[PDB]
Amino acid sequence: KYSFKCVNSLKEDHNQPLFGVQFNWHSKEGDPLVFATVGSNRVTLYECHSQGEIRLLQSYVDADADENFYTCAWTYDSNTSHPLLAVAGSRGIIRIINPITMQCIKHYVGHGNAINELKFHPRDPNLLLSVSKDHALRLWNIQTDTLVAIFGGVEGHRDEVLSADYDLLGEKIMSCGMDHSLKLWRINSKRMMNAIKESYDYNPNKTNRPFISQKIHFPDFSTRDIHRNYVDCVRWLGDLILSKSCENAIVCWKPGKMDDIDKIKPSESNVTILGRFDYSQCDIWYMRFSMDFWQKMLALGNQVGKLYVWDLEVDPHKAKCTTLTHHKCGAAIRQTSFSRDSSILIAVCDDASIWRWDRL
């Protein structure tokens, strides 16, 4: 159904892995199509132009020579309406880059170690979720520079948190990690909505109180029964979950029996599997799939440079798959990203190469 052609490739000069890539879906229509890549101590912006051109725009290089960025995510600046780019990695410091000036305008220290993923809330562009090697997720309000909530502890993850996603409504989060667990954390309670409201009301110039963070010790659901090894990428599909480990499949599943997501309580003993998307040669961890804006297609690169794209417009057992290869793309693909209009798919690799695929 979906066919793409490889129109160009570029390599960055640092020769370190590109761990992350994201198109800016928060651009204004008319704007050129821009994406960010992170690896080494760098964040780089590129624009896609005609005849396959991947045009270097500008870059931020961290003053710390031994920082290594792993992940980025785009949002809006609440003060101006223009885009912002959050980055983080091995140092465990969230940096908010203003992509206009390519300077760091805010940074957040708090995590005990490396940050593995960053996500923005789908309804509220100020609300940043980070997940960490310290076993916790944190929710920040980047307008008032406040830590709203820490998700961790008693029934929190017991090893590094590797990925998380908000659902479409931004009512709940699914996280996953090295403890081969997936954990659901609701954020639409009265308490949590009040906490977010208070975070906006906070101004340290008018008071000496600190801002009180919520400490959430108990997920609303937890399972270790989907995957056996490190779970490194999770994404909601409506009320269902897509997740993968290092076992060469993405599993489509739901908490409960074949059960309303919103009646699910922590005593739920079970899960239902609805389908799987099988592939090969993706058995190292920190390998992420993406979806298009409409969540009609799912793309994942593997450790030998193959790029799988599934048409999810289907019973998942029956989903059709396009395999995209190029004779010169042999290095491990860490992450992919579709343009907002789905016309372009970019893949980034361990050898610092970037691969541009255009929809036919």
Binding site: C246, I284, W285, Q303, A332
Partner: peptide, 5 residues
């Protein structure tokens, strides 16, 4: 498992 190939 391993992060690197």
């Amino acid at each position: 498992p391993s992060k690197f190939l």
